[PDB]
């Protein structure tokens, strides 16, 4: 019984309910496709385009064996402007502690408490920060621990779905403001979510 | 410096999101 991949599993299924919010307070998408959800005990707004979907599964079933391994610093949901250059960037930093203690109490009930107050963070982050303009995209980036084994080739678990080294154009943020969301600390899990965003 | 995905994400038109909002709740 791999608790690492208990915990890969917990962070992807938040990571997906997280970059989906993120796409809508942000409205990055129209909010037609977006469907009020409750996960976490806690209002949420998933998209029902089917390719969109996938195409956020994909990005996080590659990510997976990487968390299972705690070979994971950041994922970074980063918002492009028309210009292809970053106006915020959504930092998740995680590690697991060296030694994870699972505790009978509830593994889970209180992890996912713990993520609920992540997920109210970010539906009321639209009230900080400034619109972003028209014809912005989005783009997941991961920063990988520092030393670890040729992540590039286990990264690549979709056929077809291809991953890349980013451009400094894709990372591009010279002085900006820091908006800090949330920050756990639990006996599995230590992350850290804020924003970064365009001085 | 970090890992992106090759691939874009999907450009959903309008006419799509309307077509999602109307046929897939």
Request: aromatic share 10%.
């Given at each position: 019984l791999n608790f690492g991949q208990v915990v890969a599993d917990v962070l992807c299924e938040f990571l997906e309910v997280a970059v989906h919010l993120i796409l809508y307070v942000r409205e990055?998408?129209?909010?037609?496709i977006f469907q009020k959800r409750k996960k976490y005990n806690v209002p949420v707004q998933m998209s029902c385009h089917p390719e969109l979907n996938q195409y956020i599964q994909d990005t996080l079933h590659c990510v997976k064996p990487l968390l299972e391994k705690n070979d994971v610093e950041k994922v970074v949901v980063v918002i492009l402007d028309k210009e292809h250059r970053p106006v915020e960037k959504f930092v998740f930093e995680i590690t697991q502690p060296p030694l994870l203690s699972i505790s009978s109490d509830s593994l889970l009930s209180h992890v996912e408490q713990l993520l609920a107050a992540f997920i109210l963070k970010i539906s009321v982050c639209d009230d900080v920060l400034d619109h972003n303009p028209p014809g912005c995209t989005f783009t997941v980036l991961v920063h990988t621990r520092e030393a670890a084994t040729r992540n590039m080739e286990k990264?690549?678990?979709?056929?077809?779905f291809p991953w890349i080294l980013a451009d400094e154009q894709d990372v591009h943020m010279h002085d900006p403001r820091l908006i800090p969301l949330k920050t756990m600390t639990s006996d599995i899990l230590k992350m850290q979510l804020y924003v970064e965003e365009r001085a | 410096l970090p890992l992106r995905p090759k691939r874009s994400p999907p450009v959903i038109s309008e006419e799509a999101a309307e077509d999602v909002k109307q046929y897939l709740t």
């Open positions: 990055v998408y129209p909010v037609g990264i690549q678990v979709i056929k077809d | -």
